[PDB]
Design a protein around this ligand. Structure first.
Ligand SMILES: CCCCCCCCCCCCCCCCCC(=O)OC[C@H](CO[C@@H]1O[C@H](CO[C@@H]2O[C@H](CO)[C@H](O)[C@H](O)[C@H]2O)[C@H](O)[C@H](O)[C@H]1O)OC(=O)CCCCCCCCCCCCCCCCC
Ligand SMILES: CCCCCCCCCCCCCCCCCC(=O)OC[C@H](CO[C@@H]1O[C@H](CO[C@H]2O[C@H](CO)[C@H](O)[C@H](O)[C@H]2O)[C@H](O)[C@H](O)[C@H]1O)OC(=O)CCCCCCCCCCCCCCCCC
Ligand SMILES: CCCCCCCCCCCCCCCCCC(=O)OC[C@H](CO[C@@H]1O[C@H](CO[C@H]2O[C@H](CO)[C@H](O)[C@H](O)[C@H]2O)[C@H](O)[C@H](O)[C@H]1O)OC(=O)CCCCCCCCCCCCCCCCC
Ligand SMILES: CCCCCCCCCCCCCCCCCC(=O)OC[C@H](CO[C@@H]1O[C@H](CO[C@H]2O[C@H](CO)[C@H](O)[C@H](O)[C@H]2O)[C@H](O)[C@H](O)[C@H]1O)OC(=O)CCCCCCCCCCCCCCCCC
Ligand code: CLA
Ligand code: CLA
Ligand code: CLA
Ligand code: CLA
Ligand SMILES: CCCCCCCCCCCCO[C@@H]1O[C@H](CO)[C@@H](O[C@H]2O[C@H](CO)[C@@H](O)[C@H](O)[C@H]2O)[C@H](O)[C@H]1O
Ligand SMILES: CCCCCCCCCCCCO[C@@H]1O[C@H](CO)[C@@H](O[C@H]2O[C@H](CO)[C@@H](O)[C@H](O)[C@H]2O)[C@H](O)[C@H]1O
Ligand SMILES: CCNc1nc(NC(C)(C)C)nc(SC)n1
Ligand code: OEC
Ligand SMILES: [Ca+2]
Ligand SMILES: [Cl-]
Ligand SMILES: [Fe+2]
Lengths: 62, 28, 35, 447, 341, 82, 38, 37, 335
């Protein structure tokens, strides 16, 4: 539960760091954002579940 | 103790997201 | 003394009206070209 | 798309004056930075927050904003649960990512213009209706917000009322002053000493009540603009352009910035001295309290004590006859406060209560506030400029008030500047006098 | 032709950083002055001199650091590295404040060299030397304040020490001891500097908002002809503007610009004379008629009398740690103080 | 609009430059650092170390009181220190 | 090895952060050094 | 302080506040890269 | 009559008036005549004012023992604080002159008018087709009068703490300020002196460079000024020769060649610097004062090693301890 929580919360940070540097260069070079429109979509969708994970999971640790 | 570790990365991050664009040359 | 207050008040109203009804009078209009 | 053959680099953002879409990313990306801050700062504050210690002694300015809405606090501003703080902090921090997304999106991928990718959102500056309407939408969003407060106070919990009968405490307002005669009375109040205008609000009923009026009056105007166009004068009076509109909102913020500076500096109610520090006048008052209290214990008759000038070491009279504290503190005789009120009579400070009704909690309140006046240095060294290093402190009331006067000011310059530009832009000469038709040259010599 | 004309030739050669004959004096000094300061600011102390920490090495920040004056014992000694004081020794020199007369005297020559430069470069480029005339003003200030002044006092110790805060005390001192703010010359001084910073601002804005349109852009900066021709702003329009808002207005750029040289240069010249007088302590301290009435009548009070009391406090509370060589001891009971404070 | 000197822009961009200064710059830095950290600077400038303003007991200042026998007087002040 | 190769905009943002770092070290030194008050 | 669990992020949260400033900054990194057009 | 009011508005706004009485002017002209007229009478004949509210009148007018340098118009009483004190608020004028009534009548009308004076510096520029912004340069000196005459008093809780209207009275404002705020040690004031010093500096630079690079058109025994006629087409100085000299004094890229960029800088510098100085006084009006480095550097044992920052504190204490002799009854100066 706890480590399970620190995992979700900690991974959620690295995804953000990655997501943040990503989306930019994404819409940036139109070398796609069609193939990456797939990547970004998964990052975005993923992110939300994660927040919801840490959200609900918070009430069990603290 | 030394969370300067943090700053450092999130710091070279800003310039990175434009540099990679200087490489993939496009949309600056 | 209660008078002076009245007078002063009147006097300041005059000018303040003259001021609002002034810029209201289509001030943008007043200038060299485009209006 | 846009480069130097638009505007100069350092005026870059003006190249977006006519690209609705991108000009939306900006506002959506920016609004992100504010949420980000609000959120990211709260957690910073909480990360350093020490429960058993005054908030004002910790450089806090957001947690105290939450505390006022009745959250995580109880009797006398005692901090009970730090959860509401952590919550409000993280929530914002998250929404910052959501907004930030949209911002970045609308400014580098989505449509560079809107008018075509949807005529509902696309807009025309000179479109007196689209303008009056979008304004109308926002006038409703803000209106709902004003009620979002009225709700938290009447239904969801209350607000921190320092004037609390039993002594400062979270109280549920269930009797908002709705009497227009009173509510709007405040606007007809002098902004000088005593009658303080808006900043003189001193009880939560009026605060809550007044917000009720604003919420409605506000949404009412939101609908009215949705359903209308500027009349005639409204049109022959203003300038209709992208800059001109900005300017008008610039001068508007400036003014609100000055009003805010005075609220946090003077007001006791919506800015509880329990979370922020003691007000400027409140602290000078407390010194008089402290020493009238002390010396009185040493056997001095405060009522008849004569000071160097022959005016009254501890108590003197104000210009209209009321009994007030003496000393340079004669300038703050307009200070009212929970801790000091029980000593006031129908004629001001009552010599009998002062003589035997002073309570210990008041003595230490006066002492606390006396030693926490809003005096400090840039490098945060609490006290008078000649003081010694040791007590690292600068009242939250000082920080807030200064920062906002600066911002308020520069914005008034911003106003003048963008308004001056708009008027020349309109008539059309904001780029120079027509070498050919030089206006001055067609005017008679004043000589 | 000859070694001299060849030496010349080389010097007056148009480089990135023009050297010139003048440079032979300017650069050696100018660099040594700047250098000595930067050195002391971070390394040398003022302990043996003023009982003060004065360098980064001791804990001072950019505001509190400084190259403090020599002891009062030194008197007006030039304090040469190899003179009777330091005796060739360097470290001692440092501790006796040799670095002050070093920065002082060197920078002094550096201002001579620089003005000469202007004069030399002016001549070559074939323009009038009004840039040199103007610079007389700053020389006067430096000369009168960092040299003539302390030369009139007991020693270099009372000259302004090189440093930010160390200069603020020079200000406070002058108020407290010389009641300098009440001096006719200091006033003229400020009228000029204050009035000069006005012409600056006012003229600048008058030009930028009285410009002709020579471009199609909003950023009108590019729209400028580096190569003369027409006036870039309507001198005629400017005249009418001010003539209607202020009542008076220029109308002769040649005069408007000469005026701008005059106002601040004259101001600084006056502020200098005032100080040349403070050297002999020949100050503008009091108004006798005022003092006489204040003596006989205890109910006469002006913002002037008020100030003089502020001075008494400044002198009494500062003198002790500000003039160490005087071994001042002022018992708490002798210290002037109002009520409560 | 020009003189002999090689346009800074070109130099600040030349990989040769950095190849040289990546060495030189930090070089100078580490040197000055050591200048302070080795306590050498304190002796080069007679500047007191945190434990050398006063003697343990004394609370008086080592004020130089006469020009000519100044150096001599200063030396004696160092005497009391330790 | 001359002729611009190290892109300028990078020389700057790098030499730039480099200064905010050293000047920032100074600001930290203000709450710890000798220039402290503790 | 930060709820017991998140404590591991104390340090992280210590720098978050300053980020906004960075953006105003980046806009300059960018223009420099795009040669101030 | 094309319509009286229609006409009136045409006159007021007329750009053919010797002095442009504008719309802002309709408020300016009267307020400024009141401020000026009341001042002149005050300064010459007003009687003593109990500035500190402790019944200790400070006479500051000529006829009552003052000379130009000492004389001043004294601030309203401290007994009054921030309360509005219009003549119709006094049992009599005698009472009004004693509590420093004239001061308010003057500062309020002046500040009012001086603002409109700004509003006017815009209007005329509009009616004349010239770019605005000049009025924005004047926002700095105005924003100062405001800081010194209103913000500081609001902040401090009394008009009696506003800067007096007189020479010496101003030095008083300064000397005390420094004691209570240690302004010389505040970033904003420093930026202020940079702007003022700088201004004067640049004012001299421009002034000389230009005047020194004027094209010859005058005799050897004829005012070099005549070489210019009002309403010229081409320039009167060689801005290329100017730049040529100045570029060599320092070095080329460190010199202006664009008269527009030159003049922007020329205006920008002082105005920006004074803006900060005004924000300084407006900021120290809420007690956020200058840096306090008192007893920072201390030695190995704990002894306090003084810096020039300390010598400054002593001079400040002298001022603190002696100002307002009889006005304090307690330990801390919180007002
Ligand atoms: C025409 C265009 C003009 C453009 C002009 C642009 C001007 C721009 C100005 C920009 C910014 C001004 C910024 C101010 C930042 C203030 C930071 C600060 O206050 O930070 C405060 C901190 C803390 O200071 C520390 O404060 C500390 C302690 O407080 C305390 O801490 C202690 C424990 O640590 C105890 O608890 C104690 O009781 C408690 O009070 C200690 O005393 C330290 O010893 C002390 O050093 O700052 C320090 O250390 C600070 C060392 C500061 C040097 C500061 C210089 C500042 C401004 C210079 C302007 C120069 C202009 C030159 C122009 C030239 C040409 C134009
Ligand atoms: C940015 C600025 C943003 C401003 C934002 C909002 C301002 C809102 C103002 C509402 C004002 C109502 C009012 O104001 O009413 C205003 C009053 C009328 O005042 C009232 O006069 C009243 C009393 O008459 C009576 O009371 C007396 C005893 O008090 C006696 O009994 C007497 O006989 C009896 O008749 C009381 O004294 C009140 O306290 C007093 O406020 O005048 C005045 O405000 C005069 C105000 C002068 C302002 C001068 C400004 C100068 C420079 C400004 C630059 C701005 C930028
Ligand atoms: C270019 C440059 C442009 C420069 C513009 C400079 C400044 C603009 C300032 C605008 C201020 C609007 C202030 C305001 O609404 O301000 C309200 C404040 C507060 O006023 C003070 O309010 C005080 C009382 O608070 C106390 O009393 C209250 C009840 O009365 C409550 O109980 C409260 O909790 C308690 O603490 C007292 O009544 C004081 O006498 C009263 O002066 O404004 C004051 O002081 C105002 C003094 C105002 C002069 C305004 C001229 C406007 C034209
Ligand atoms: C454009 C400008 C460009 C300027 C470029 C400048 C370049 C170099 C400047 C050099 C300056 C040298 C200053 C020398 C000095 O101060 O030298 C000082 C000594 C005199 O020294 C003083 O002597 C004093 C004591 O006199 C007493 O004690 C003495 C015995 O010790 C005798 O008994 C004497 O009679 C008795 O009165 C004290 O000892 C002082 O501490 C000591 O400084 O000689 C002398 O000055 C001889 C002085 C010739 C002085 C020329 C002065 C010019 C302006 C002066 C303004 C004064 C106000
Ligand atoms: C504070 C907010 C802010 C915002 C929202 C904008 C927005 C915009 N600006 Mg400015 N600008 C700013 C501040 C800001 N600016 C400042 C302070 C300056 C002075 C230095 C300028 C100077 C300037 C100029 C000179 C120009 C603009 C232009 C533009 C537009 C550029 C479109 C583009 O080319 O994308 C390019 C974007 C990139 C190459 C990468 C940026 C990625 C950004 C969005 C995010 C970085 C954060 C992070 C990594 C993202 C994580 C998101 C998260 C959800 C995962 C755009 C609408 C241009 C214009 O007006 O065109 C018509 C133009 O010429 N701006
Ligand atoms: C703050 C103001 C704001 C505004 C005015 C707009 C306006 C617009 N957007 Mg965004 N957008 C924003 C913020 C904003 N957006 C943010 C923060 C994000 C990131 C999450 C996005 C992400 C986004 C995307 C990915 C797209 C747009 C698109 C569009 C355009 C759609 C027009 C259309 O064709 O019909 C579409 C009709 C609508 C979009 C309106 C329906 C809105 C619903 C779905 C949500 C309302 C929000 C929320 C759930 C309500 C609160 C509920 C409560 C219970 C809590 C329009 C101009 C689209 C576009 O580029 O079109 C050309 C598109 O593809 N926007
Ligand atoms: C939140 C922003 C907001 C904005 C930007 C606007 C903007 C506008 N509204 Mg509006 N309105 C709003 C909210 C807003 N409203 C709300 C909440 C309501 C509900 C009450 C209304 C109700 C409303 C009505 C009923 C009307 C407008 C009208 C107008 C237009 C008026 C043009 C004008 O001359 O005004 C400038 C105001 C003046 C020139 C009058 C001068 C008044 C003097 C006496 C005092 C000025 C203030 C003083 C100097 C300082 C403050 C003192 C303090 C005591 C208040 C304008 C575009 C008019 C219109 O034509 O609509 C289509 C109209 O008839 N509005
Ligand atoms: C409240 C909203 C607001 C908005 C939306 C705008 C929007 C705009 N303004 Mg503007 N302005 C405002 C308020 C506002 N202003 C205020 C209050 C002032 C008074 C100071 C000004 C003064 C102003 C001027 C003088 C000018 C503009 C201009 C512009 C346009 C500039 C385009 C650009 O590239 O940005 C430019 C942004 C930059 C170059 C970034 C530099 C910012 C510097 C000056 C300050 C940074 C401050 C920060 C706190 C310091 C931290 C430093 C760090 C190292 C620690 C743009 C449309 C320009 C224009 O051409 O308009 C038509 C112009 O010349 N504005
Ligand atoms: C280069 C331009 C120089 C201009 C003036 C140089 C003067 C040099 O003057 C000379 O310095 C050396 C030290 O370096 C001194 O040498 C003296 O100081 C050192 C310390 O520095 C002592 O250890 C030594 O015992 C002592 O005699 C000489 O006594 C002095 O006469
Ligand atoms: C919250 C309170 C709000 C209160 C609002 C009170 C509003 C009171 C009056 C609104 C009056 C509009 O009044 C009308 O304005 C137009 C300009 O637009 C004037 O027209 C005016 O301007 C033109 C130029 O444009 C002049 O040549 C003309 O002589 C002049 O009169 C009308 O003469 C005036 O009657
Ligand atoms: C046209 C002469 N060149 C020139 N250059 C400069 N450069 C600074 C940096 C001093 C503004 N100033 C001037 S006088 C305003 N003139
Ligand atoms: Mn005029 Ca500011 Mn020192 Mn309390 Mn009075
Ligand atoms: Ca932490
Ligand atoms: Cl007094
Ligand atoms: Fe000029």
């Amino acid at each position: 539960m706890t480590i399970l929580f620190q995992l979700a919360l900690a991974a959620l940070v690295i995804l953000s760091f990655v997501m943040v540097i990503g989306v930019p260069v994404a819409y940036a070079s139109p070398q796609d954002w069609d193939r990456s429109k797939q990547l970004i979509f998964l990052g975005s969708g993923l992110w939300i579940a994660l927040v919801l994970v840490v959200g609900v999971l918070n009430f069990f640790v603290v | 103790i030394a969370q300067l570790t943090m700053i450092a990365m999130i710091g070279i991050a800003g310039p990175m997201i434009i540099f990679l664009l200087a490489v993939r040359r496009g949309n600056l | 003394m209660e008078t002076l207050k009245i007078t002063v008040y009147i006097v300041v109203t005059f000018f303040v009206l003259l001021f609002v009804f002034g810029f209201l009078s289509g001030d943008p209009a007043r200038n060299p070209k485009r209006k | 798309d846009q480069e130097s053959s638009g505007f100069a680099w350092w005026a870059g953002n003006a190249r977006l004056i006519n690209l609705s879409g991108k000009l939306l990313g900006a506002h959506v990306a920016h609004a992100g930075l504010i949420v980000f801050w609000a959120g990211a700062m709260t957690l910073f504050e909480l990360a350093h927050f020490i429960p058993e210690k005054p908030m004002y002694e910790q450089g806090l300015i957001l947690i105290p904003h939450i505390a006022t809405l009745g959250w995580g606090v109880g009797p006398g501003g005692e901090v009970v649960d730090t959860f509401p703080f952590f919550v409000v902090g993280v929530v914002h921090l998250i929404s910052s990512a959501v907004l930030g997304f949209g911002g970045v999106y609308h400014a580098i991928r989505g449509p560079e213009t809107l008018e075509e990718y949807s005529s509902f959102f696309g807009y025309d500056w000179k479109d007196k209706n689209k303008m009056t309407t979008i304004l109308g939408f926002h006038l409703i969003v803000l209106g709902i917000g004003a009620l979002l407060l009225v709700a938290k106070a009447m239904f969801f919990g209350g607000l921190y009322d320092t004037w609390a009968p039993g002594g400062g405490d979270v109280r549920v307002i269930t009797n908002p002053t709705l009497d227009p005669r009173v509510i709007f009375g405040y606007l007809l109040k002098s902004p000088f000493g005593g009658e303080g205008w808006i900043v003189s609000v001193n009880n939560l009923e009026d605060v809550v009540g007044g917000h009720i009026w604003i919420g409605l009056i506000c949404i009412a105007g939101g609908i009215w603009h949705i359903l209308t166009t500027p009349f005639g004068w409204a049109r022959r009076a203003f300038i209709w352009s992208g800059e001109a509109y900005l300017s008008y909102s610039l001068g508007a913020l400036s003014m609100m910035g000055f009003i805010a500076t005075c609220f946090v500096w003077f007001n006791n109610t919506v800015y509880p001295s329990e979370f922020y520090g003691p007000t400027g006048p409140e602290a000078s008052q407390a010194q008089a309290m402290t020493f009238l209290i002390r010396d009185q214990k040493l056997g001095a008759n405060v009522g008849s004590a004569q000071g160097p000038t022959g005016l009254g070491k501890y108590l003197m009279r104000s210009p209209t006859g009321e009994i007030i504290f003496g000393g340079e503190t004669m300038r703050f005789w307009d200070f009212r406060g929970p801790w000091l009120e029980p000593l006031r009579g129908p004629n001001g400070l009552d010599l009998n209560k002062i003589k035997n009704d002073i309570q210990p909690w008041q003595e230490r309140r006066a002492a606390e506030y006396m030693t926490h006046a809003p005096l400090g240095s840039l490098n945060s060294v609490g006290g008078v400029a000649t003081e010694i290093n040791s007590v690292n402190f600068v009242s939250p009331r000082s920080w807030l008030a200064t920062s906002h006067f600066v911002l308020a000011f520069f914005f008034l310059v911003g106003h003048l500047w963008h308004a001056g530009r708009a008027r020349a832009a309109a008539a059309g000469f904001e780029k120079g006098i027509d070498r050919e038709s030089e206006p001055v040259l067609s005017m008679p010599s004043l000589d | 032709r000859g070694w001299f004309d060849i030496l010349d030739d080389w010097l007056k050669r148009d480089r990135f950083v023009f050297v010139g004959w003048s440079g032979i004096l300017l650069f050696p000094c100018a660099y040594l002055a700047l250098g000595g300061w930067l050195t002391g600011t971070t390394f040398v102390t003022s302990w043996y001199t003023h009982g003060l920490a004065s360098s980064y090495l001791e804990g001072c920040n950019f505001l509190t650091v400084a190259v403090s004056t020599p002891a009062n014992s030194m008197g007006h000694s030039l304090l040469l590295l190899w003179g009777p004081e330091a005796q060739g020794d360097f470290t001692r020199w440092c501790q006796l404040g040799g670095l002050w007369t070093f920065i002082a005297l060197h920078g002094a020559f550096g201002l001579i060299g620089f003005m000469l430069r202007q004069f030399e470069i002016a001549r070559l480029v074939g323009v009038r030397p009004y840039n040199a005339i103007a610079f007389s003003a700053p020389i006067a200030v430096f000369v009168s304040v960092f040299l003539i002044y302390p030369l009139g006092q007991s020693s270099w110790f009372f000259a302004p020490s090189f440093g930010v805060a160390a200069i603020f005390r020079f200000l406070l001192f002058f108020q407290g001891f010389h009641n300098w703010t009440l001096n006719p010359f200091h006033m003229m001084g400020v009228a000029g500097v204050l009035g000069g910073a006005l012409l600056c601002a006012i003229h600048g804005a008058t030009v930028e908002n009285t410009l002709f349109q020579d471009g199609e852009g909003a950023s009108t900066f590019r729209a400028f002809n580096p190569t003369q021709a027409e006036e870039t702003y309507s001198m005629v329009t400017a005249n009418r503007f001010w003539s209607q808002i202020f009542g008076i207005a220029f109308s002769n750029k040649r005069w408007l610009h000469f005026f701008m040289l005059f106002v601040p240069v004259t101001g600084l010249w006056m502020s200098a004379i005032g100080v040349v007088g403070l050297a002999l302590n020949l100050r503008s301290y009091d108004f006798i008629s005022q003092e006489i009435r204040a003596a006989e009548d205890p109910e006469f009070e002006t913002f002037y009398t008020k100030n003089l009391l502020l001075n008494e406090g400044i002198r009494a509370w500062m003198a002790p740690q500000d003039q160490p060589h005087e071994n001042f001891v002022f018992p708490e009971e002798v210290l002037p103080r109002g009520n409560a404070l | 609009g020009t003189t002999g000197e090689r346009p800074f822009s070109d130099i600040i961009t030349s990989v040769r430059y950095w190849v040289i200064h990546s060495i030189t710059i930090p070089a100078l830095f580490i040197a000055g650092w050591l200048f302070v950290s080795t306590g050498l600077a304190y002796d080069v400038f007679g500047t007191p170390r945190p434990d050398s303003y006063y003697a343990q007991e004394q609370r008086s200042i080592p004020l130089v009181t006469d020009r000519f026998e100044a150096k001599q007087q200063v030396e004696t002040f160092l005497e009391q220190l330790k | 090895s001359e002729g611009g190769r190290i892109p300028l905009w990078i020389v700057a943002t790098v030499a730039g952060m480099g200064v905010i770092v050293i000047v920032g070290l100074f600001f930290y030194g203000a709450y710890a050094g000798l220039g402290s008050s503790l | 302080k930060l709820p017991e669990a998140y404590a591991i992020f104390d340090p992280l949260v210590d720098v978050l506040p300053v980020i906004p400033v960075l953006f105003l900054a980046l806009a300059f990194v960018w223009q420099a890269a795009v040669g101030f057009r | 009559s094309a319509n009286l009011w229609e006409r009136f508005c045409n006159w007021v706004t007329s750009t053919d008036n010797r002095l442009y009485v504008g719309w802002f002017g309709v408020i300016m002209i009267p307020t400024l005549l009141a401020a000026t007229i009341c001042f002149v009478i005050a300064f010459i004949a007003a009687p003593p004012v109990d500035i500190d509210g402790i019944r200790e009148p400070v006479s500051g007018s000529l006829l009552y023992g003052n000379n130009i340098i000492t004389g001043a118009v004294v601030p309203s009483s401290n007994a009054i604080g921030l309360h509005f004190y219009p003549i119709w608020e006094a049992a009599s004028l005698d009472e009004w002159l004693y509590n420093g009534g004239p001061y308010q009548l003057i500062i309020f009308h002046f500040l009012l008018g001086a603002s409109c004076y700004m509003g006017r510096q815009w209007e005329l520029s509009y009616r004349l087709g010239m770019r605005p912004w000049i009025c924005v340069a004047y926002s700095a000196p105005l924003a100062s009068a405001f800081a010194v005459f209103l913000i500081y008093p609001i902040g401090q809780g009394s008009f009696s703490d506003g800067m007096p209207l007189g020479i010496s009275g101003t030095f008083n404002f300064m000397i005390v300020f420094q004691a209570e705020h240690n302004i010389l040690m505040h970033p904003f004031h420093q930026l202020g002196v940079a702007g003022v010093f700088g201004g004067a500096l640049f004012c001299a630079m421009h002034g000389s460079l230009v005047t020194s690079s004027l094209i010859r058109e005058t005799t050897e025994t004829e005012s070099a000024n005549y070489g210019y006629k009002f309403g010229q087409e081409e320039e009167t100085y060689n801005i290329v020769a100017a730049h040529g000299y100045f570029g060599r004094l320092i070095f080329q890229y460190a010199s202006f060649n664009n008269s527009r960029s030159l003049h922007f800088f020329l205006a920008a510098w002082p105005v920006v610097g004074v803006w900060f100085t005004a924000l300084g006084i407006s900021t120290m009006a809420f007690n956020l004062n200058g840096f306090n480095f008192n007893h920072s550097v201390i030695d190995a044992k704990g002894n306090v090693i003084n810096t020039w920052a300390d010598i400054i504190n002593r001079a400040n204490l002298g001022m603190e301890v002696m100002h307002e002799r009889n006005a304090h009854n307690f330990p801390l100066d919180l007002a």
